[PDB]
Amino acid sequence: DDKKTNWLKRIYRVRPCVKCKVAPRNWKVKNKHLRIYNMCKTCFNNSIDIGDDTYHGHDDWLMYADS
Amino acid sequence: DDKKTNWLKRIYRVRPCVKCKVAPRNWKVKNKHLRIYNMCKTCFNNSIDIGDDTYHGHDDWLMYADS
Ligand SMILES: Nc1ncnc2c1ncn2[C@@H]1O[C@H](COP(=O)(O)OP(=O)(O)O)[C@@H](O)[C@H]1O
Ligand SMILES: Nc1ncnc2c1ncn2[C@@H]1O[C@H](COP(=O)(O)OP(=O)(O)O)[C@@H](O)[C@H]1O
Ligand SMILES: [Zn+2]
Numbered sequence: 552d553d554k555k556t557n558w559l560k561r562i563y564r565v566r567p568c569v570k571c572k573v574a575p576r577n578w579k580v581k582n583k584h585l586r587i588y589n590m591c592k593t594c595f596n597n598s599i600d601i602g603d604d605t606y607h608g609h610d611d612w613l614m615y616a617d618s
Numbered sequence: 619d620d621k622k623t624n625w626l627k628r629i630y631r632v633r634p635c636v637k638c639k640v641a642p643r644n645w646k647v648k649n650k651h652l653r654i655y656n657m658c659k660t661c662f663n664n665s666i667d668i669g670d671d672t673y674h675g676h677d678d679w680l681m682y683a684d685s
């Protein structure tokens with residue numbers, strides 16, 4: 552129910568990439584959840600190239616108001 | 619994973635009861651989810667007494683970082 556989705560949009564917007572601190576985070580939809588990763592796509596691909604997993608991670612959010 | 623819980627604490631704190639606009643919302647833990655209701659307990663009980671379901675509702679949040 553759309554008020555939940557609006558919260559998820561707010562939460563996404565206020566959390567820039569943990570590495571570059573400017574770009575928005577990468578994300579994906581998996582089944583009924585939104586997965587927000589810690590970094591943008593550029594910084595994540597770079598983290599593999601440099602050998603750092605320090606900022607790897609994510610959090611999952613239910614995209615519906617009722618579980 | 620505790621960073622998720624910290625977000626849920628922020629989201630809860632910034633959303634006063636939709637009716638009285640001052641008190642924090644009622645909530646409950648159901649299985650792996652946090653249910654945040656639209657109103658505080660006082661306003662919800664009052665809504666039954668006055669016959670208004672306008673502000674009845676809730677949103678559910680996964681309490682873990684990985685779904
Ligand atoms: N953009 C990113 N920023 C930080 N960590 C990421 C990013 N993309 C993938 N990861 C990490 O890489 C791993 C793989 O994630 P993912 O592909 O979503 O796994 P799954 O197989 O469960 O769908 C996870 O630890 C995830 O946190
Ligand atoms: N404090 C409250 N504020 C607004 N609506 C509420 C409140 N408490 C209960 N409700 C509403 O009353 C109904 C019953 O909720 P609940 O007891 O959590 O149902 P369930 O049987 O699924 O566990 C729902 O529509 C819920 O949104
Ligand atoms: Zn970045």
Ligand SMILES: [Zn+2]
Pocket residue numbers: 635636637638639640641657658659660661662
């Ligand atoms: Zn109230």
